[PDB]
Ligand binder design. Structure first.
Ligand SMILES: *[C@@H]1O[C@H](CO)[C@@H](O)[C@H](O)[C@H]1NC(C)=O
Ligand SMILES: *[C@@H]1O[C@H](CO)[C@@H](O)[C@H](O)[C@H]1NC(C)=O
Ligand SMILES: *[C@@H]1O[C@H](CO)[C@@H](O)[C@H](O)[C@H]1NC(C)=O
Ligand SMILES: *[C@@H]1O[C@H](CO)[C@@H](O)[C@H](O)[C@H]1NC(C)=O
Ligand SMILES: *[C@@H]1O[C@H](CO)[C@@H](O)[C@H](O)[C@H]1NC(C)=O
Ligand SMILES: *[C@@H]1O[C@H](CO)[C@@H](O)[C@H](O)[C@H]1NC(C)=O
Lengths: 199, 166, 49
């Protein structure tokens, strides 16, 4: 299946603060009016990023799975919310073909829209997020504030999903034009290559 | 192992730290230096990542809870969030400018008066004007035709024993 | 002024000779509160080797 992500998927590309100034930045962004592979379980590729979204009711979507060969003999990340905290590992736990050991990291800590973004820039993990109430992907604009960072340097090519609806995009290297308001909040953006008026 | 041997057979504990390095962010690192904070002086700073020289002053900008820097329309550093106590500072380049030697005719006199351009000369008889601050010139409340123009409506001239007036 | 004009006499006017520049007083360095130190007290101070 397919659907059309109208205007979503803009994340603060850096840490500076700019007030009421139009800036033009080039990075990996989700192209405007793209297709998102509407879903309702299997593995997927990790071309250069993701735009995992969701519209859940009771936290049916839990976590994720990453990694190149997705089992032993090559490392593979993990993220889970097992009703306690977001346990993170880079271990080689045998990846069951239907899920729901010598490792070098660890960590332990429709009305929702858990928009997320994932990037393996320089092989290390980078996560953004924005958790918005809603009441079938709505239009509207909202930026993404970074919340985590993992210095792993693992080699990722593929990922998966654990267990409402969720979607998937793919980031691409496109130039935008961001409208910081006075508070420094991204308020609007223009895709710099969509069509002649935008150019 | 007996406590009353010599040192030769006497037990010793050994720990061997094997420092290994790969293409990793290398988080296992020792404490960095941290000096106390001084404001209102042209100091040579190095905040968490970035460096430079300026005159740090307490500010009133409101960063977002995750931002750290600030920038102008021309992409220049302007504000820094202090990593220890989260108060936002500003950054002003400590002043510079030019030196200009006013003279009447050397034929007339050897006395001059200097004008430092665009400073407050409180850290640089002594007069503060709108174009700089003038050193070595009386102030009159009268008005005449312009003799030696200076800027922003100030003209100085040599007048009566005599001296230089502005 | 004379040395910039290449003259021993200068007529009435205003001339520019040099440049003003405040110098940096001192250095300052800031970094986040260094906490979470290594549990080296766990391997050196351990019970049994
Ligand atoms: C992408 O979206 C367009 C418009 O919705 C659709 O026509 C197309 O089939 C979708 N898939 C691909 C691979 O282009
Ligand atoms: C990592 O440990 C596994 C067993 O847990 C072992 O088979 C493997 O050889 C080890 N890797 C290296 C590089 O020593
Ligand atoms: C991952 O594999 C690619 C080629 O498939 C290689 O260029 C890259 O260096 C590898 N990275 C790591 C961390 O092994
Ligand atoms: C900016 O921040 C202030 C501080 O809470 C808030 O009251 C205001 O709604 C925000 N937005 C605008 C546009 O002022
Ligand atoms: C200028 O200098 C000449 C000699 O060099 C002198 O005779 C004359 O009086 C001077 N005039 C003034 C106005 O100083
Ligand atoms: C000169 O410095 C003092 C102290 O910093 C300040 O109060 C004063 O306003 C300054 N002068 C001008 C003209 O701003």
């Amino acid at each position: 299946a397919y659907t059309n992500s109208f205007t979503r998927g803009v994340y603060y590309p850096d840490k500076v603060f700019r007030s009421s100034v139009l800036h033009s930045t080039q990075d990996l962004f989700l192209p405007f009016f793209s297709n998102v592979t509407w879903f309702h379980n299997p593995v997927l590729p990790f071309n250069d990023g993701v735009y995992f979204a969701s519209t859940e009711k009771s936290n049916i979507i839990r976590g994720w799975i990453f990694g190149t060969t997705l089992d032993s003999k090559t490392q593979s990340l993990l993220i889970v919310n097992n009703a306690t905290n977001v346990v993170i590992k880079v271990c080689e736990f045998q990846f069951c073909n239907d899920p729901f050991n010598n490792c070098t990291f660890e960590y332990v800590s429709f009305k929702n829209l858990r928009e997320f973004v994932f990037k393996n820039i320089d092989g290390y993990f980078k996560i953004y997020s924005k958790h918005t109430p809603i009441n079938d992907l709505p239009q509207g604009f909202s930026a993404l504030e970074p919340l985590v960072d993992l210095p792993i340097g693992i080699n990722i090519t593929r990922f998966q999903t654990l267990l409402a609806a969720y979607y998937v995009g793919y980031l691409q290297p496109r130039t935008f034009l961001l409208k910081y308001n006075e508070n420094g909040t991204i308020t609007d953006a223009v895709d710099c290559a969509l069509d002649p008026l935008s150019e | 192992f007996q406590p009353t041997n010599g040192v030769g057979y006497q037990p010793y504990r050994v720990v061997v730290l094997s420092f290994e390095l790969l293409h990793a962010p290398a988080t296992v690192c020792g404490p960095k230096k941290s000096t106390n904070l001084v404001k209102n002086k042209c100091v040579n700073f190095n905040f968490n990542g970035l460096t430079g020289t300026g005159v740090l002053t307490e500010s009133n900008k409101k960063f977002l809870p995750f931002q750290q820097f600030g920038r102008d329309i021309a992409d220049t550093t302007d504000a820094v969030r202090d990593p220890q106590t989260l108060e936002i500072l500003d950054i002003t380049p400590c002043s510079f400018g030019g030196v200009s030697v006013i003279t009447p005719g050397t034929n007339t006199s050897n006395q001059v008066a200097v004008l430092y351009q665009d400073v407050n000369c409180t850290e640089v008889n002594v007069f503060q004007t709108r174009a700089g601050c003038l050193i070595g010139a009386e102030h009159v409340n009268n008005s005449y035709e312009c003799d030696i123009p200076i800027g922003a409506g100030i003209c100085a001239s040599y007048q009566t024993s005599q001296s230089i007036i502005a | 002024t004379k040395c910039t004009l290449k003259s021993f006499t200068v007529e009435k006017g205003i001339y520019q000779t040099s440049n003003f520049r405040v110098q940096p007083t001192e250095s300052i360095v800031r970094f986040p509160n260094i906490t979470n130190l290594c549990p080296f007290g766990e391997v050196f101070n351990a019970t049994r080797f």
